[PDB]
Design a protein around this nucleic acid. Sequence first.
RNA 1: CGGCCCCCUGGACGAAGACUGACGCUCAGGUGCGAAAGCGUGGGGAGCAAACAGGAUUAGAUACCCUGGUAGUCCACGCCGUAAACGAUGUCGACUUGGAGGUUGUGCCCUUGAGGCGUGGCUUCCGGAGCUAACGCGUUAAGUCGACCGCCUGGGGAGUAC
Lengths: 66, 156, 225, 88, 259, 129, 70
Amino acid sequence: FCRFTAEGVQEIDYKDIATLKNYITESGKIVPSRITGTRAKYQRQLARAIKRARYLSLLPYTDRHQ
Amino acid sequence: ELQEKLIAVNRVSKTVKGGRIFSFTALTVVGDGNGRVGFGYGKAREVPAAIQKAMEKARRNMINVALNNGTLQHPVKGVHTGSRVFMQPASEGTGIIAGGAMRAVLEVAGVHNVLAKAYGSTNPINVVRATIDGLENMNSPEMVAAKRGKSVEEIL
Amino acid sequence: TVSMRDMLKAGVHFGHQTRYWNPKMKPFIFGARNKVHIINLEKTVPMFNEALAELNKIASRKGKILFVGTKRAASEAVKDAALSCDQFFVNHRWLGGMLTNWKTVRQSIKRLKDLETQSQDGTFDKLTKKEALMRTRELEKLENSLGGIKDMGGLPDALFVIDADHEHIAIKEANNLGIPVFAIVDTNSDPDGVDFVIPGNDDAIRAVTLYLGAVAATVREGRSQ
Amino acid sequence: SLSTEATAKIVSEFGRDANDTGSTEVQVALLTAQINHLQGHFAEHKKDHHSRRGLLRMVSQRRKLLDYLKRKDVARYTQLIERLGLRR
Amino acid sequence: ESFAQLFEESLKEIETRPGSIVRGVVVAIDKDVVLVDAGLKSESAIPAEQFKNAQGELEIQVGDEVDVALDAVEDGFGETLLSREKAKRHEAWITLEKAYEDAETVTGVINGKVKGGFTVELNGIRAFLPGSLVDVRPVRDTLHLEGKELEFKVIKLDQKRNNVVVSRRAVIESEDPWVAIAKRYPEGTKLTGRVTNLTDYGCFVEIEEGVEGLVHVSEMDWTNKNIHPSKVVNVGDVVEVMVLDIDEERRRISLGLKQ
Amino acid sequence: SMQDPIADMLTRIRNGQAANKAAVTMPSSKLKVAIANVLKEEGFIEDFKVEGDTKPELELTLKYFQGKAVVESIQRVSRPGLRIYKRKDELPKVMAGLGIAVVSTSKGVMTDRAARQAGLGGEIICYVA
Amino acid sequence: PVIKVRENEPFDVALRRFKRSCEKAGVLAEVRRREFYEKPTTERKRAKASAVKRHAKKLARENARRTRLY
RNA sequence: CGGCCCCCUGGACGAAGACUGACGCUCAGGUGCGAAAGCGUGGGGAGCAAACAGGAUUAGAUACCCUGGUAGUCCACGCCGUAAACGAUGUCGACUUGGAGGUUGUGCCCUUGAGGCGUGGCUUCCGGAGCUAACGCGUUAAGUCGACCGCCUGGGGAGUAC
């Protein structure tokens, strides 16, 4: 039950923070493709986006850090 | 009318808590001196019983073999497990030139004239089986004609 | 004899799901509707007719038919079919080596018969309660197993089967001895052991009944002849 | 890889029809150019072994093509090797 | 001939996949198993509990016709998913009928809110609606005679996840689950959910528009460990459950049943 | 790479026989066609049919007698690795005359017996039984 | 697993919640994993072995299930 | 071969077309790449840790366990050329029943929805015929064949001596 297949997105955006936030943990970790049911191709992209965000301090690497 | 030859009898063991329980295997083969052959492999605590069992086995599940007179119809290979066997038809007078288990099966089958070598393994049980297979597969001229949609004179 | 329309109504044309099929049943299959295999009734019917004819012929020479169906849905029905044409049957689990090992099973049959006699003809009663109970239980067991085949005497001259994959042991036994086999064979089943294959729905009850009934009729006809 | 425009240019020059592209000579030229390009890369990056494998393969292919040309038609081959400046 | 080919496309034309065409004739009844034949490869093993109406006893003898459902084929041997869901489509059609004249009228009787909306029951089934839907104003049916007779006037429906809150009394008055997972959230919002499969540690009740709930084994009852959930509740049944916990991230809404 | 077309054809035929295939198709060649014809004559196949202009496909139609296959055995003898040429006296007898040996001679491809009759030997293509 | 006790929330409940959070995180498990160095090979082996086991559980057992026990 | 980014760069696959026209397959010698450890010169050195030291354990404990700990692991440029370098399965091509997946394209179809019907590439598991000493392999063959190469000929002595 993938979101990105239905939406039909060409590429996942690191700037689209809200969307990312659904796929990240309360502890900051990226959520598995088993749980979200994201398609494999998209999942990787999502992960990449998240990573990018983390570099730009848009998303946090973890809950504890400060 | 049926002739029956006990090829081999072998003592086989099973280890148990006490020690070794021994038993006997009898390999026999029976035939009517014509196409019909059948081998039987019987097992029992005593030899004679085992032999009897083997004979019984043999007597059912026989198999027919097309024999051109006293000999085979063409050279035939037969394989089974280790034992791979070649047997070749031969002129009247030559006798059964074949070794061991193989000979016995031939004799009962009512082949009188063969040139037969057992390559590979010569484990009696396997070799007899191989021989049987060879005999079975061997097709006659008439049969071949039937298969091919021809007369016997067309094939020669 | 049996029409195509009737068969269709029954649900003969339906088969099993596509993932459970046997590719040896690819000739008898027509297509796949809703991911479920459809048996070709054009190829089935003539075969069925032939089988029926064969059965009739067998009957005519005083042949013994054995009706096998241990599905538990069509156990009631097969027995009924058997009884209509006064033939023998195995509606509960086929005893491994019923036919191949007849001589042992002949003893069992005899025992059963004896038990029955004791129950009915003796009218002795006066038996220790536990022992009596045990005896009764034994009788029940025997009846369930060998009730249809108690009057068979020897081996049957033909073997009608409701499912080939389910009764493969029986089929195998029939092949070893060389008894003609008349199997109803769904798409999942293997037709190679069967002599007179009948491509049709083993599972559906109505279809099974239909299959039985025609066969029974043919047997009766043969007997009459 | 070789840029599209460059490739096109190469094809036009060596190819008779210019739409042809698959002419032996054209192919050779294409290979050669690529090889030349990669020389610069490999001077810089001596440990890039994986990449160099591809280059080697390309070279081999080119050689094969040349050989083929030679047996078929000698003059053409000679011309080609003059144009490209291939020692053999 | 092509008689059969044409007959095949004919029979394709005169059936469909869902429980739509009321076709299976009940051809054997035995407690506790009904069985039909809707022109499928095999007969359904129907429960008796998809067919007793509103007080516990059976309603349909031999020959009677209800459609079932489909799109799932062969678990080993057999054919269907249950006809009772069939019924849900009919209910949906009646609810939809409202749209035409902007007023669906039956009877709705809603005594109380498991999760903030009185429960309304139509015919056999009972549904849960959001808190406003029960009353047109602030009237509140707590002062009304218990389990009172009105109808239902619809207040709110969730359109994906099936929750419908309907309007008792006042006759005169006339990606996708996981972003905004804050609706049934706040601590203990009770829900009505059908269980799906009980995995010997769990029960998997999950209804609210493409989510997954567990109610695992620890609550379920008021005994902890010796319980074995197959004994204690059901298979395929709409129950009392509420959230107790949502993680919108590692989609594990952990519902409960001891409440 | 494809090195021996005749051999390949033979293999295909064998596989068809094994797998109870009605007809066996392959890319056509003149030699192959000839072989097929020979087979037909000798009665190991039902019929052969070449079809196409640019790249034609030979289609043999295999034969089955009493369930089992007709072509009991079919081996190449000459092969690209190691060629076999026989003189008319040295020509073989497959299955003691019951099978046939396809032999390519100066006067076209023919069965061994035919070749013998003619009075000429040649390259031994395949034994068929 | 950062948590804040809600207004008029019991202590025990809070503790339970915290525990749950921890479990979700898989923090303890992670710690256990990083206690000692696992050779890459060993890691690989475990993963594949585990996968195999899972597969066995899924399919073979399902096949078994089809047939009744008594 | 595993954070993220950029620059240079090799291969794979699909979609249609268009072109070249057997240019192919395999390969003794030859050439290159080739884990870890190891070597050389120059850097670096957190953690880990051969060696080493102490503390235990023990009959002993030149080990396992504990506390420390140096080469080394890291980088640059050279050398080494071996591993259960394994799928213990040479490369290339053709042919022979099926099922359940994964991954990555792509054509059509009302995408009426996460779908429906195909068609390509790579890939995991199960299993048929056949094969196999059996175990098992089974369209990714260990089946049926062809082309080329490599290699084996009882165990030890020995992959050692010269």
